[PDB]
Amino acid sequence: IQMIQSPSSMFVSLSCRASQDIRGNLDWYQQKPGGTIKLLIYSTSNLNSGVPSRFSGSGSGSDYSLTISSLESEDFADYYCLQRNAYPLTFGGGTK
Amino acid sequence: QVQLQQSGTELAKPGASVKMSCKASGYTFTNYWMHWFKQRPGQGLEWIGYVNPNTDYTDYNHKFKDKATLTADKSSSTAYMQLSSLTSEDSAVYFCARGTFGNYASFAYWGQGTLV
Amino acid sequence: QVQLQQSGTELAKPGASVKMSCKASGYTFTNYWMHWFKQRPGQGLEWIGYVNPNTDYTDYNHKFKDKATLTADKSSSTAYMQLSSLTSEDSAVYFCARGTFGNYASFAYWGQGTLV
Amino acid sequence: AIQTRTVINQHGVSETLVENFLSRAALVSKRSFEYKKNFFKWTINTRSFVQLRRKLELFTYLRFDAEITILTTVAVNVGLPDLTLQAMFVPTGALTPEKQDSFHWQSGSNASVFFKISDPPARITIPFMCINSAYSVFYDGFAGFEKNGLYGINPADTIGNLCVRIVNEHQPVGFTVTVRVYMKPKHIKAWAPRPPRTLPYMSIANANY
Amino acid sequence: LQLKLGNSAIVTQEAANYCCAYGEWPNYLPDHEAVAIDKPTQPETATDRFYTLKSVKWETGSTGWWWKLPDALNNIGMFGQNVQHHYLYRSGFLIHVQCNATKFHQGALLVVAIPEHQRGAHNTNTSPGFDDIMKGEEGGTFNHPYVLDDGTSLACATIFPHQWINLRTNNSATIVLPWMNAAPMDFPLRHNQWTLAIIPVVPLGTRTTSSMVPITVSIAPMCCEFNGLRHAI
Amino acid sequence: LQLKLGNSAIVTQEAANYCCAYGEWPNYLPDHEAVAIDKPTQPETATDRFYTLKSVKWETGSTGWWWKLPDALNNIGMFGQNVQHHYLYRSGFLIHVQCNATKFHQGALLVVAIPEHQRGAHNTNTSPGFDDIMKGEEGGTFNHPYVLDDGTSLACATIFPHQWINLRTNNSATIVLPWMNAAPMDFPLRHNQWTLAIIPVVPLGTRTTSSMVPITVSIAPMCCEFNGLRHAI
C-alpha cells in the first residue's frame, strides 16, 4: 500500500489519497523543528486531548484531508499522515 | 509521567554493527508494544518493526528483515535494537514509540532520536 | 541534641561597646537559666551572671555590675550579652552554659567561645 | 474570597408551598404624568418586569386574585392643596376614557375609588375574571383565525385596565404625579410545571431569543 | 486511687472530686438526623487515653499559662490524626492538674476553664493574628493576668467553673467539661471552645532560691465522635 | 447481582456460585486461650473491601500468572497498614476473577488456588532467593506452566479447588478460601499460605491480531483478626 499527499509545500486544506480503502484508520502527526512529535487527529475525525480546537479532519472511503481555520507562528511545521489498517504501516510525504 | 529516553548519538565505520536502547519509565513495561522508526535526513519516515515485551515476538518490515534485530529486557525496562552490516545509506535518525493497551498502532509517546 | 552555637570572634577599639549571642537549639528555651563566663588567656575562669528567660530577672557578679548587661529573646531563641566601656583588660574568651531544670548550677552543655 | 462553613439543622416543609411562594406583592407599574395625555392608563398584564415574569412562567395554568395597591407621590413644578384622585377599573366590554374630562369617568357601572394624597394608599381586590377555569400563561394558538392573527394571544385571558385621574379643576400651579402599582396574588392554585428560562427576554409579546 | 481510662492510667492521686463544669456530661448527640446525616463514626476505644502534656515550671516571677483545648491535641496521637481527614467533631474533655511540692512551700493557683475566650492585644488597634492564637501544645503566657488579656477582671473570674490548688491543703484539681457550643458539631481546625488557664494568685516562696515546683496537665477527650468516612455507595 | 462488602461493591456480575474451597468458611478462632493471650483485636468493618488489582493482558502467546495472597495485599490500603505494627494475623479470602470478551473470541482458563506452593528453579542447584518469591502486587509469570514450576504436572492440578473460565459459556469465577495452616495464627511478612494461579490451557484466537481480552482479579479478606496492640497496664 502506498499513500501520496498532494501538496509538497505550503505558503490550508492538506489532503492525502490512498492506494486502497482504509475505512477510517488514519492519524495526523506534526513535527516541530526542535525534534518533538505529537499527534493531532486520531481515527480521522477525533481530536487529541490537549490540542487547540481549530484543527479538524474530513472523512471518506479513500481520500482524507485536514482543515485548519486560522494560522499562527509555531503552527508552521511539516505534517504527516499514517494508515494503521494493515501491516506494514506507511506514512506520507509531508508538506511545508 | 511517560518518558522514552534514548541513548546519545554514535557513528561507525562500514562493515560493523551497532546497538542502541530506548529506556522507558512511568508505566508498566510489559503491556505495550515498542515500535521503531527510521527517518533519512530530509525525507519522510519508515516503519522498521516492533517487539512484544510480554512474549518476545517480533514482526519486521520486509525491507529490514536482514538488517535489524529487536530484543526487549524486562528487568532493566529497556528495549534494544541492533543493526548489522552498516553501509553509507544507514545514516539516519532512529525513533522509538509506544503502542496502546489494546494492540493498536497510534503513537502518543515518542523518543528524541539518535543519529548514526 | 543540645547545641550552644556562639558567634564568631570580633575586636574593638577602647571606649566602645560590643554585643554577642549564644543561640540555643534542641530543647525548650524558657526553662533553663543561661550563665555566662570569662577566661583571661592563660588563667582560670570567672562567673559573670545569668539571665532567666522565663522571667527576665538577672543576677550579676559584683565585679561585673557596671560592665555587662544580659538580655534574652524568646522568639529567636537567643541569649545576648552587651559590654560597655571596653579597656585593654577585656581581651578574653567568653562562654555560655546551661543550668538544670531545677535551678542548680551544674553545667553539662557549653559554647565554643568568642575572643574579644 | 474566604471560604466558610456552618452546620444546618432544619425541619420546615411549609415554606416552599405554592400559596406562599407567590404572595409577595411585587411592583408591576411605574409611570409619571404631568398635569397643567394627562392621566395614567395601564393594561393589567403581568409580564412587564422580568423579575416576576420568569417566576410566573414555571407553570402552565394558574388561578389567583389581584390585590392592587396604588401609591401616589405628588410634587409642584411648595404646598399642594388637598388633591383628590380617582382610580376607575375598566373591565372588558366597557369603554376606556380617552381624555381627562370625558363622560366615561361618570359611568356608574364600573368600580371607582376616591382617595386623597394624605390618606394611607388605596386598595381593592379583584376577583378571578377569566372565562376559562385558569389563566393560560402559555397559549399555543391563534386568536385571529384566517391567516393573520397574533400568535399566542388568548382572547379569554384578558382582565381589564385601570385609569387614574386628578379630580380637581385647573389650578394656577402645575404639578407632577408619580404612580406606583403593587399587585399581590392571593389564593394560588397552579398546575403543570415547566422548565425555567435561561436566555434573556427580547419582547413583551412573545418568547423570542 | 487511679484513673484507668483505656490504654493509659494516671495512678496514685490524692482524693479528688469530679466537679462537673455546670451540670452536664458529654451525652453523645441524642437526636439530630436533620444535620450532617452520615451517621457519626463515634470512636470510643481509641481516643480516651490521658494525653499528658509537658511539665511547666512555676517560679516566683511567673505569671500564668493558657491552653486552647481543641488546639492542644491537634498534633498528638490518635485524636490528632482524626482531626485531619474529618471536618466535624463533638467531644467533651476531662482535665487533671497536679503539682507537687514539699511541706515547706507555700502558694496558691486558680485552675479556671473559660468558654469562648476571645483575647485582645494591648495598646493597639489591630486584631490578633493567626500565630498569636494557634500556639499549639506549648500553650501561652498571660501578659497582663489581672485583666485576663481582654479587660474583664480576675476578681470576678470565679463565675466560670474553677478549682483552687492551695499548697497548704491539696495539690490536685479535676474538671469535667461538657459540649459548650451553639452548633451541634463544630470545626476543629479553626474554632476553640474552651480555654484552660491556670494563674498563680499568691506567688511562691522559700528560704532558698527559685524552687521549680513543676506542674503536670493531663487532658482526655470524653465522648468523642466525628463524621462518617465510610458509606455504602 | 452485586457484591456489596463494606465500603466498596463490585456490581453487575454474571450468575456465580460460592464454591467454598474444601468445606469451610473463616470461623473466627473458636477457642485458643493457650496461645498469644492478648485477645485478638478482630477488625471487621475496615478491612473487607474488594481490593481490585491491576488488569492483566491475555494475548495468544501468554503463559500464566500467579499471586501470593498474603503478599499481594501487604502494601495496599487498610489491610496493608495492619501488616506493619502487628505480627500475627488470621484471615480467609474471597477471590473474584472476571474477564470480558465478545462472542467472537474463544479460549479457556484454569483458575486454581494452591496451598503451600513451594516453587523451584529450573536447571540449577540453588534455591530461589527472596526477590524471586516476594514479587508483590504485580505477581509473576510461569516459565514452565506444564509442570507448575515444581515438577508436579498440570494434568493432575484439578485436585486443588478450581474453576474454569470457558469464554463460550461464562466469564467469571469465584472461590472462597478458609484458613489453611497448621499453626493457629501466622506471620504475614514471611509466610504465604495460598497461591492464586490462572493458566490459559487453550490459547485465544480471532481473525484479526492479538486482541487483549483484559482480565480483572479482586481479592477481599473475609474474617480477619490480629494481635492486641492495646492493653490495660
Q: Where are the beta strands (DSSP E) in B1-116?
A: 3-6, 19-25, 34-39, 45-52, 57-60, 69-73, 78-82, 93-98, 114-115
User: Which subunits sit against E, judged by 3+ Cβ pairs under 8 A?
Assistant: C, D, F
C-beta of residue A31 within 8 angstroms of C-beta of residue B95: no
Quick one: how far is CA E53 from the chain centroid?
A: 11
Adjacency order of strands within the sheet including F106-113: F65-68, F195-205, F106-113, F162-166
The CA-CA-CA angle for residues B4, B10, B16, to 5°, reads 115
C-alpha closest to that of C90 among C13, C5, C4 = C13
C-beta of residue A92 within 8 angstroms of C-beta of residue A80: yes
C-alpha closest to that of E104 among E172, E173, E167, E14 = E167
SS3 for C105? Answer: coil
Grid cell 562493515 in the structure block, residue: B15
Cell of D187: 389564593
Rounded-to-integer distance, Cα F199 and Cα F109, Å? 6
Rounded-to-integer distance, Cα F111 and Cα F173, Å? 7
Contacts of E156 (CB under 8 A, 6+ apart): none
State how beta strands F89-90 and F225-226 pair.
Answer: antiparallel
Cell of D157: 385571558
Query: Using a CB-CB distance cutoff of 8 angstroms, which residues of chain B are in contact with residue F209?
Result: 103
> Of all residues in chain B, what percent are helix, strand and coil, respectively (each to 5)?
5, 40, 55
C-alpha closest to that of C22 among C32, C30, C12, C34 = C34
Rounded-to-integer distance, Cα E138 and Cα E54, Å? 8
CA distance B105 to chain F (A): 12
Locate the domains of chain B by residue range. Answer: 1-116
Q: Burial, E99: exposed, middle or buried (Cβ in 10 Å; 0-12, 13-18, 19+)? A: buried
C-beta of residue A82 within 8 angstroms of C-beta of residue A44: no
- DSSP code for E56: B
C-beta of residue E230 within 8 angstroms of C-beta of residue F46: yes
> Rounded to 5 degrees, what are φ and ψ at E169?
-105, -60
Rounded-to-integer distance, Cα A89 and Cα D9, Å? 66
What residues does F199 pair with on adjacent strands?
A: F110
Quick one: how far is CA F157 from the chain centroid?
A: 16
Quick one: how far is CA E58 from the chain centroid?
A: 18
Query: Using a CB-CB distance cutoff of 8 angstroms, which residues of chain E are in contact with residue F231?
Result: 7
**What's the sign of the alpha-carbon dihedral B83, B86, B90, B91?**
positive
Q: In terms of residue numbers, what domain contains E124?
A: 1-233
Give the helix ranges, DSSP H, for A16-94. Answer: none
Neighbours of B89 (CB within 10 A): 7
Residue of B nearest to F214 (CA): B102
Rounded-to-integer distance, Cα B25 and Cα B15, Å? 34
Helical (H) or strand (E) element with D51: helix D50-56
* F74, F75, F78, F79: CA torsion to nearest 10: -10
Considering only CB atoms, which residues of chain E are within 8 Å of chain C? 54, 57, 59-62, 138, 209-212, 214
C-beta of residue A95 within 8 angstroms of C-beta of residue A7: yes
Cell of C82: 552587651
**CATH for the stretch D1-209:** 2.60.120.20
Rounded-to-integer distance, Cα F148 and Cα F195, Å? 12
Rounded-to-integer distance, Cα A1 and Cα B47, Å? 13
* D201, D202, D203, D206: CA torsion to nearest 10: -70
Rounded-to-integer distance, Cα F52 and Cα D4, Å? 37
State which amino acid sits at residue E226: F
The CA-CA-CA angle for residues D107, D109, D112, to 5°, reads 75
What residues does C38 pair with on adjacent strands?
A: C46, C94
Burial annotation E53-90 (CB, 10 A radius, 16+ → b, else e): beebbbbbebbbbbbbbbbbbbebeebeebbeebebbb
State how beta strands F215-221 and B3-6 pair.
Answer: unpaired
C-alpha closest to that of D90 among D68, D69, D105 = D105
Cell of D167: 379630580
Grid cell 490451557 in the structure block, residue: F201
Rounded-to-integer distance, Cα C52 and Cα C39, Å? 22
Considering only CB atoms, which residues of chain C are within 8 Å of chain E? 28, 31, 52, 54-55, 57, 101-103
Neighbours of E172 (CB within 10 A): 18
Residue of E nearest to C102 (CA): E212
Rounded-to-integer distance, Cα D56 and Cα D43, Å? 18
Grid cell 437526636 in the structure block, residue: E31
State how beta strands B93-98 and B114-115 pair.
Answer: antiparallel
C-beta of residue F210 within 8 angstroms of C-beta of residue B104: no
Max Cα distance, chain B (Å): 41
C-alpha closest to that of E53 among E43, E68, E36 = E68
SS3 for D5? Answer: coil
Quick one: how far is CA E161 from the chain centroid?
A: 12
Rounded-to-integer distance, Cα C74 and Cα C32, Å? 12
Helical (H) or strand (E) element with F111: strand F106-113
CB contact (8 A) between residue E54 and residue C55: no
Max Cα distance, chain D (Å): 66
Grid cell 496537665 in the structure block, residue: E217
Q: Are A and D touching by the rule of 3+ CB pairs within 8 Å?
A: no
C-beta of residue A40 within 8 angstroms of C-beta of residue A26: no
State which amino acid sits at residue B18: V
> Rounded to 5 degrees, what are φ and ψ at E65?
-145, 150
Q: Where are the beta strands (DSSP E) in D2-67?
A: 26-35, 40-43, 59-65
What residues does A14 pair with on adjacent strands?
A: A66
Cα first-last separation, chain B: 28
C-beta of residue A91 within 8 angstroms of C-beta of residue A81: yes
Residue of C nearest to E138 (CA): C28
Q: Considering CB atoms only, which of D5, D6, D10 is closest to E34?
A: D10
User: Which subunits sit against B, judged by 3+ Cβ pairs under 8 A?
Assistant: A, F
Residues 9-28 of chain D with CB under 8 A from chain E are 9-11
Report how many domains make up chain E: 1
Quick one: how far is CA E72 from the chain centroid?
A: 8
C-alpha closest to that of B22 among B84, B111, B116, B103 = B111
CATH of the domain at F29: 2.60.120.20
Rounded-to-integer distance, Cα C2 and Cα C100, Å? 13
Query: Using a CB-CB distance cutoff of 8 angstroms, which residues of chain F are in contact with residue E6?
Result: 230
State how beta strands F2-5 and B69-73 pair.
Answer: unpaired
State which amino acid sits at residue E30: P
Cα separation values, E153 from E71, E147, E148, Å: 25, 4, 6
Cα separation values, C39 from C14, C42, C44, C48, Å: 19, 8, 6, 10
The number of C-alpha atoms within 13 Å of E126 and in the hemisphere containing its C-beta is: 4
CB contact (8 A) between residue D9 and residue E185: no
Q: Are B and F touching by the rule of 3+ CB pairs within 8 Å?
A: yes
Q: Are B and C touching by the rule of 3+ CB pairs within 8 Å?
A: no
Rounded-to-integer distance, Cα D194 and Cα D201, Å? 17
**What's the sign of the alpha-carbon dihedral C20, C26, C29, C32?**
negative
Neighbours of B9 (CB within 10 A): 11
Which of C28, C54, C58 best tests the E interface by mutation, with the highest count of E CBs <10 A?
Answer: C54
C-beta of residue A28 within 8 angstroms of C-beta of residue A95: no
Rounded-to-integer distance, Cα E95 and Cα D190, Å? 61
The number of C-alpha atoms within 13 Å of F110 and in the hemisphere containing its C-beta is: 21
C-alpha closest to that of D89 among D131, D134, D53, D123 = D123
Which of A87, A89, A90 best tests the B interface by mutation, with the highest count of B CBs <10 A?
Answer: A87
State the resolution, in angstroms. Answer: 3.6
Which of B55, B56, B74 best tests the F interface by mutation, with the highest count of F CBs <10 A?
Answer: B55
Rounded-to-integer distance, Cα F28 and Cα E68, Å? 44
Rounded-to-integer distance, Cα E132 and Cα E147, Å? 18
Cα first-last separation, chain E: 49
Max Cα distance, chain C (Å): 41
Contacts of B94 (CB under 8 A, 6+ apart): B20, B36, B37, B38, B39, B48, B81, B113, B114, B116
**What's the sign of the alpha-carbon dihedral E176, E182, E187, E192?**
negative
Neighbours of D89 (CB within 10 A): 19
SS3 for F55? Answer: coil
Query: Using a CB-CB distance cutoff of 8 angstroms, which residues of chain C are in contact with residue E143?
Result: none
**What's the sign of the alpha-carbon dihedral A88, A93, B3, B8?**
positive
Contacts of B79 (CB under 8 A, 6+ apart): B21, B22, B23, B24, B34, B51, B53, B70, B71, B72, B73, B96
